[PDB]
Amino acid sequence: MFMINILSLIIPILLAVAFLTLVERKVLGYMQLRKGPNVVGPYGLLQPIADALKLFTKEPLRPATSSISMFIIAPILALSLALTMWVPLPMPYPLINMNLGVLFMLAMSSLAVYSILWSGWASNSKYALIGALRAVAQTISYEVTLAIILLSVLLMNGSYTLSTLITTQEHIWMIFTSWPLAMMWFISTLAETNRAPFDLTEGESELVSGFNVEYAAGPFAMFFMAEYANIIMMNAFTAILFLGASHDPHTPELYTINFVLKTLALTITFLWIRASYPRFRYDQLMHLLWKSFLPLTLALCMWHISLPIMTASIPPQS
């Protein structure tokens, strides 16, 4: 019966990712004065299915100069970790209830980079290596700031339990308390998910395909699914963190609908941003994160440590 719950979490996530791709194409098209997919199915509703069936019936290629074990392990690790990040999210009840769910997401997101690193290295081609090294620089840029931002925000929660965040925001959204932290958190999520204007690893105009340039068919499809599931997952995490829906224990579906609407709004904002800005330079991303976000984040961390003691606002939990 817990297996049924695992499947009821996994399969709908994959369906949402498949249709997220259709949504991105349609939103970008209408923002570019065109229509996007509207032939394959009514309103392009069958386009993701055609894409998936096409990618899983095409020839997967193993490069001659590549290391096979890492080459094959990396997409598996990417997709499995993308699916694993969803299990502690309370919607309003989590599949897995963790004391330190935030730390769990931090650690698994840190482990997810090695899929790109090992993929790029094991492809044994120059563009894949350049993409992998860009991933190294990107993680170095965003990780410290993202962790300190999370700590500063959760000083209002009293713990790292994700369900407590619902109780914390019972009367007001936490974005009214820490919008300067929310802005930097949103930009750091853009960097962490390798999304434009921070999509350095793929580097399409610049590096052709970046890290997965040598990937074809099903393995490439798995990388794509992992990336889009990560987009949805990070936006759901932000929605839980900063825009807390009210939860009625006798009618949890109201919370579920509200939370899903907020997650969709944030994902559509991601797609909106991709159609508006040019790409960063990756050293410029490092300098943005280390010379602007880091000092402000340190100062705001001190402020959010002092404020509950200043005003006698310390949250309950031990």
Partner 1 sequence: ASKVKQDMPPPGGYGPIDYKRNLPRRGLSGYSMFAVGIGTLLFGYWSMMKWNRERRRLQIEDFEARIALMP
Ligand X SMILES: CCCCCCCC/C=C\CCCCCCCC(=O)OC[C@H](COP(=O)(O)OCCN)OC(=O)CCCCCCC/C=C\CCCCCCCC
Ligand Y SMILES: CCCCCCCCCCCCCCCCCC(=O)OC[C@H](COP(=O)([O-])OCC(O)COP(=O)([O-])OC[C@@H](COC(=O)CCCCCCCCCCCCCCCCC)OC(=O)CCCCCCCCCCCCCCCCC)OC(=O)CCCCCCCCCCCCCCCCC
Q: Which does 67 bind (CB under 5 to 8 A by kind): ligand Y, ligand X, ligand UQ, none?
A: ligand Y
- DSSP secondary structure letter of residue 243: S
Q: How far apart are CA 132 and CA 142, in angstroms?
A: 16
Q: Is residue 80 involved in binding ligand Y (CB under 6 A)?
A: no
Q: Is residue 306 involved in binding partner 1 (CB under 8 A)?
A: no
Sketch the per residue contact string, 139 through 178, with ligand UQ: x for CB under 6 A, - otherwise: ----------------------------------------
Start-to-end CA span in the chain (Å): 33
Q: Which of 244, 129, 252 lies closest to 175 in space, CA to CA?
A: 244
The stretch near ligand X (CB under 6 A) out of 97-105, 116-124, 174-182, 197-205 is: 97-105
Q: Is residue 106 involved in binding partner 1 (CB under 8 A)?
A: no
Q: Which listed residue (78, 153, 167, 236) binds partner 1 by CB under 8 A?
A: 167
| Spatial contact of 73 and 65, defined as CB atoms under 8 Å apart | no
**Which position's Cβ is nearest ligand X?**
99
The stretch near partner 1 (CB under 8 A) out of 16-24, 117-125, 169-177, 286-294 is: 169-177
Q: Which listed residue (170, 205, 250, 251) binds partner 1 by CB under 8 A?
A: 170
Q: Which listed residue (73, 91, 294, 301) binds ligand Y by CB under 6 A?
A: 73
Q: How far apart are CA 280 and CA 285, in angstroms?
A: 6
Q: Omega into 249 within 30° of 0, i.e. cis?
A: no
Q: Which listed residue (15, 68, 257, 265) binds ligand UQ by CB under 6 A?
A: 15
Q: Quote the crossing angle between the two packed helices 179-192 and 294-311, to the nearest 10°.
A: 140
Kindly identify the residues of this chain, within the stretch 38-67, that bind ligand Y according to CB under 6 A.
67
Query: With CB under 8 A, what is the number of residues at the site for partner 1?
Result: 22
Q: Residue-wise over 72-110: b if at least 16 C-beta within 10 A, else e?
A: ebbbebbbebbbbbbbbbbbbebeeebeebbebbbeebe
Give me the least distance between CB of 240 and ligand UQ, in Å please: 24
Q: How far apart are CA 46 and CA 142, in angstroms?
A: 37
The residues facing 251 across adjacent strands are: 248
Q: Is residue 68 involved in binding ligand Y (CB under 6 A)?
A: yes
Q: How far apart are CA 91 and CA 26, in angstroms?
A: 28
Q: Is residue 80 involved in binding ligand X (CB under 6 A)?
A: yes
Q: Is residue 76 involved in binding ligand UQ (CB under 6 A)?
A: no
Kindly identify the residues of this chain, within the stretch 125-164, that bind partner 1 according to CB under 8 A.
156, 158
- DSSP secondary structure letter of residue 251: B
Q: Is residue 313 involved in binding partner 1 (CB under 8 A)?
A: yes
| Spatial contact of 175 and 243, defined as CB atoms under 8 Å apart | yes
Q: How far apart are CA 80 and CA 57, in angstroms?
A: 21
- Which residues make up the interface to partner 1 (CB under 8 A)? 156, 158, 167-168, 170-172, 174, 176-180, 307-308, 311-317
- Which residues make up the interface to ligand UQ (CB under 6 A)? 11, 14-15, 17-18, 21, 24-25, 28, 48-49, 51-52, 55, 204, 221, 224-225
